[PDB]
């Protein structure tokens, strides 16, 4: 369908000695494909999907250089922000950033993003126009004026519309056997008595990709939300995802209840009932 590339960076300061812990992860859609961890011995960007391994030495050097530079920038920023906010040297603090691009099924640019946070709260973000900045507070406002003077948004726009989209298209082609394959959910229903007169019906979706899914209960053909429980979508650990939704019902009335499953991999939604 449409596709995304996203990078997620986290720095966590280490009061008392040395540099922050820096972690970077890259995704295409919901597939991790690279990582960098400052705690790891390689000090290199490392592959996490088979289809990235073919990239040559220059790719790995360049990508390593980029994230190392960002880790240093984060270190500096952690210090200057601590100063701005008059915070002690004692506490650990964090900077996070997410950036990336979305492309349509024709491979054309749809949208770009570049947003960051300090201590888990919005700091500065590029707006959807890729021209303007959203600054959450007066430190970020200071940053905004600095980056306006330095043409930073222009650089980011050119990255997001250019490099980002070009490389995303490349990955989608190189990794097409998995990246452009949808794995529809494998579904089933379980039944768990909660007394001698009521039971939980749990509707399972397993082994699906991508992670986006909708699970709903209906009773007598209309959605029911009362007396239901919907768990957060969770990773299986093999690249696929899991979710379930449950409902408590009077025993003997199970045939009234139907579970409905919507996913990109299902041309029509699926309906399950208890046998």
């Amino acid at each position: 369908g449409s596709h995304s590339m996203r990078y997620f960076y986290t720095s966590v300061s280490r009061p008392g000695r040395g540099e922050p812990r820096f972690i970077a992860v890259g995704y295409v859609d919901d597939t991790q494909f690279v990582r960098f961890d400052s705690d790891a011995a390689s000090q290199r960007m490392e592959p996490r999907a088979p289809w990235i391994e073919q990239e040559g030495p220059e790719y790995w050097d360049r990508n390593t250089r980029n994230v190392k530079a960002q880790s240093q920038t984060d270190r500096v920023d952690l210090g200057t922000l601590r100063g701005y906010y008059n915070q002690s040297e004692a506490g650990s603090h964090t900077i996070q950033m997410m950036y990336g691009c979305d492309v349509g099924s024709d491979g054309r640019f749809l949208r770009g993003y570049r947003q960051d946070a300090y201590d888990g709260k919005d700091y500065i973000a590029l707006k959807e126009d890729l021209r303007s900045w959203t600054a959450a507070d007066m430190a970020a406002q200071t940053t905004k004026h600095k980056w306006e003077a330095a043409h930073v948004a222009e650089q980011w726009r050119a990255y997001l519309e250019g490099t980002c989209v070009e490389w995303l298209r490349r990955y989608l082609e190189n990794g097409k056997e998995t990246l452009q394959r949808t794995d529809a959910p494998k579904t089933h229903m379980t039944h768990h008595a909660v007394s001698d007169h009521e039971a939980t019906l749990r509707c399972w979706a397993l082994s699906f990709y991508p992670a986006e899914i909708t699970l709903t209960w209906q009773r007598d053909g209309e959605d029911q939300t009362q007396d239901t429980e919907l768990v957060e979508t969770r990773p299986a650990g093999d690249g696929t995802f899991q979710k379930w939704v449950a409902v408590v019902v009077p025993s003997g009335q199970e045939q009234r209840y139907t579970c409905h499953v919507q996913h990109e991999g299902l041309p029509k939604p699926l309906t399950l009932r208890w046998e």
Partner: peptide, 10 residues
């Protein structure tokens, strides 16, 4: 492919 853009905030 990562961004090469790494300007400081303050």
């Amino acid at each position: 492919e990562t961004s090469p853009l790494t300007a400081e905030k303050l």
